[PDB]
């Protein structure tokens, strides 16, 4: 006995508790999501592993919305992410009406940041084991991308990625342009990255999922399915087969 | 500790069948060693 799995309201010889490290191991144990921000907007893309044919998606995904201007994606356990999220939209909404403004991305983050840190000080409520990726395009500020960790740490990003693949993805991402052309071009590019990432994950099929907040979307949050998803896929299939 | 990373990069080149290295082998090598460590 270590004497501190039992707690979650105290210090340890490692400082923070073992329970908090573990929550960080579990997100990495999940699938793989990336995000790329640009000057015209921000793109989200996520890999979903296929289980069997019986099943079908219709309310359980991995891409989630916040409000009606905010895009949300996560790694970790599905049920818990959904629980965090329903409350966030609601908290955002009371603000939205009350101050009369359409909430910032930055303010939303602060509100979530504070919740998670409070749960680390107590042993009443075990933490979430998710990592949440959020961001959009603000009409007068730009695109801003943030990622919040279960480790009580959050930052503003040009790219962020999570999953088993994390290290490797950030390397490829790191290789590319700051501007990265136009958003549309990025839809194709992100698809190559996922396409190639899957050779490393391949034990069964996958489904490619892409989303966007674009200048053309006019800052709203929408999914990219349709022919648009398929072309980016064809371009990856031509280039390599991996 | 650094020497091992250098040699590590060198294995991946033999795998690639080149006497020619890239920046990538060093980035990956360094991370490989870091994890394995205390």
């Amino acid at each position: 006995g270590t004497g501190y799995d039992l707690s979650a309201s105290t210090f340890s010889p490692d400082g923070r508790v073992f329970q908090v490290e573990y929550a960080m191991k579990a997100v990495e144990n999940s699938s793989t999501a990336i995000g790329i921000r640009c000057k015209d907007g921000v793109v989200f893309g996520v890999e979903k592993l296929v289980l069997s044919k019986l099943y079908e998606e219709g309310s359980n995904k991995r891409l989630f919305n916040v409000d009606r201007h905010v895009g949300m994606a996560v790694a970790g356990l599905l049920a818990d992410a959904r629980s965090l999220a329903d409350i966030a939209r609601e908290e955002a909404s009371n603000f939205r009406s009350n101050f009369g403004y359409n909430i910032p991305l930055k303010h939303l983050a602060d509100r979530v940041a504070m919740y998670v840190h409070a749960y680390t000080l107590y042993s009443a409520v075990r933490p979430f084991g998710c990592s949440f990726m959020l961001g959009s395009y603000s009409v007068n500020d730009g695109a801003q991308l943030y990622m919040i960790d279960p480790s009580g740490v959050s930052y503003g990003y040009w790219g962020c990625a999570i999953g088993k693949a994390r290290q490797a993805a950030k390397t490829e991402i790191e290789k590319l342009q700051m501007k990265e052309m136009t958003c549309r071009d990025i839809v194709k590019e992100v698809a190559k990255i996922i396409y190639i990432v899957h050779d490393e994950v391949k034990d069964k099929a996958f489904e490619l999922e892409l989303s966007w907040v674009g200048e053309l979307t006019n800052g709203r949050h929408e999914i990219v399915p349709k022919d648009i998803r398929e072309e980016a896929e064809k371009y990856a299939k031509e280039s390599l087969k991996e | 500790d650094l020497r091992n990373v250098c040699t590590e990069a060198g294995m991946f080149a033999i795998r690639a069948d080149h006497d020619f290295v890239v920046q990538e082998d060093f980035m990956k090598a360094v991370r490989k060693v870091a994890d394995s460590k205390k």
Partner: protein, 239 residues
């Protein structure tokens, strides 16, 4: 004694758990230093990143608590950010209720009491952070107050932060004999110099982050590159 799910009085005289907060309070390699003059009070920090897939225009470890007051935090990030939010509310409230400005010292003492209770609970731990308060009072002049999360706070002639504090202390004492002989900028220069010796890094324009409090202004401002480079250049000329 039993640290296992409770904290008690011990013959140890301290607590293993309180020491552990003192010990790991940084998990990176930043170091900080703060000096006090009658011309300025300056805090010098770093800017560092691991990659460039990350932004650095929102990344900061210097907080503007309010117009007059500034706060640099050494602590776990989660804990540093929480405490700021709590403080921001408490200050504002003190302004509303009293109608007068909140003294720097007053905040440090109030916050200290909040730390202390948590030390009595064996159902909750204190936040892990050292908070350095700096400000310009019109009631004793500029004021520099450091807190530690034992409930201890005191005002100092200058102080240093990071894990190499004692090493920085040695330079500081030498310096602190004469410091009222420094004019404005020359305060700043010396302040850069003592972090560069410890840390053993001759700074670069995007690695350093000097924050200054200025007397005869209620400004806390982080300095522009031109001024920051002007100093850096200034030590070259004496080398």
């Amino acid at each position: 004694g039993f640290d296992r799910h409770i904290t008690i009085f011990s013959p140890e005289g301290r607590l293993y758990q309180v020491e552990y907060a003192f010990k790991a309070i940084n998990q990176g390699g930043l170091t900080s230093v703060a000096v006090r003059g009658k011309d300025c009070a300056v805090i010098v920090t770093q800017k560092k990143v691991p990659d460039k897939l990350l932004d650095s225009s929102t990344v900061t470890h210097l907080f503007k608590i309010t117009e007059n007051i500034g706060c640099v935090m050494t602590g776990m990030t989660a804990d540093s950010r929480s405490q700021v939010q709590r403080a921001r509310y408490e200050a504002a409230n003190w302004k509303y209720k009293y109608g007068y400005e909140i003294p720097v010292d007053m905040l440090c003492k109030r916050i200290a009491d909040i730390s202390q209770v948590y030390t009595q609970n064996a159902e909750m731990r204190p936040l892990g952070c050292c908070m350095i308060l700096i400000g310009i009072d019109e009631e004793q002049g500029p004021q520099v107050y450091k807190c530690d999360p034992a409930g201890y706070y005191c005002g100092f002639k200058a102080t240093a932060a990071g894990v190499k504090q004692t090493e920085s202390t040695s330079f500081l004492e030498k310096k602190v004999k004469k410091k009222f002989d420094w004019t404005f900028e020359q305060t700043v220069e010396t302040a850069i110099t003592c972090l560069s010796t410890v840390l053993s890094i001759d700074f670069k324009p995007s690695e350093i982050e000097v924050g200054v409090v200025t007397v005869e202004n209620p400004k806390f401002r982080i300095l522009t590159e031109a001024e920051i480079d002007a100093h850096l250049v200034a030590l070259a000329e004496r080398d």
